[PDB]
Structure 1
């Protein structure tokens, strides 16, 4: 599914990401914009042979099992394909685990490079939340 901006903001709030580990909602919407363009079916191969999946481009090296990432872990205990669903629940519960891990949202290179320090509140402008 390709989420609408305000549509994703509302689902992310409802699932408890607004200010999760101190990251306001616009941070999360911003990260999804630049990771997936709001498309739950986004997949992208990394140089290390791992793959990123879903609206938040959660990676198979640590976080999900795709059966084809040597030496990998599955810390969120999910098939990577569950991150592709139009239901963002597995993605959100997995993001919560990732962002508590130490480096916060820096774990999303696109967040660090494209969202961090910007007017991320713009990503939730106009939304009834």
Structure 2
């Protein structure tokens, strides 16, 4: 599923991401824009052979099982395929573990480089929340 901006903002808010670990909703929308262009089915293979999955490009090196990342962990205890669903629940639940794990949203390279420090409220403007 490819979300519209405000559509995804509402869904993310429904799923409790607004102010989660202190990150306002626009941080999460911005991260999703630049990680996946709002596409739940986004996948990208990393140099190390791991793959990133879903609207927040969660990495099979650590967070999900895809059966083809030798030596990896599955810290969210989910198949990576679950992160490609139209239903963003598995992605959100795994993102909550990631953001709680010490480095906050810096785990998302695109957030650090493109969203951090910026006017992230812009990402939720015009949206009914």
User: For this structure pair, what is the TM-score category when the shorter chain's length is used for normalisation?
Assistant: over 0.9
Match of 2:89 in 1: 89
Q: Where do 5+ consecutive residues of structure 1 fail to align?
A: none
Q: TM-score, normalised by structure 2?
A: 0.99
Match of 2:64 in 1: 64
Q: Distance in 2 between matches of 1:53 and 1:3?
A: 15
**Aligned-residue RMSD, C-alpha:** 0.4
Runs of 4+ in 1 over 6 A off after TM superposition: none
Q: TM-score, normalised by structure 1?
A: 0.99
How many equivalent pairs are there? Answer: 129
Pairwise CA distance, 1:122: 0.4
Q: Distance in 1 between matches of 2:27 and 2:90?
A: 19
Match of 1:50 in 2: 50
Deviation digits for residues 23-52 of structure 1 (CA, Å, limit 9, x no counterpart):
000000000000000000000011111100
Deviation digits for residues 71-105 of structure 1 (CA, Å, limit 9, x no counterpart):
10001010000000000000000000000000000
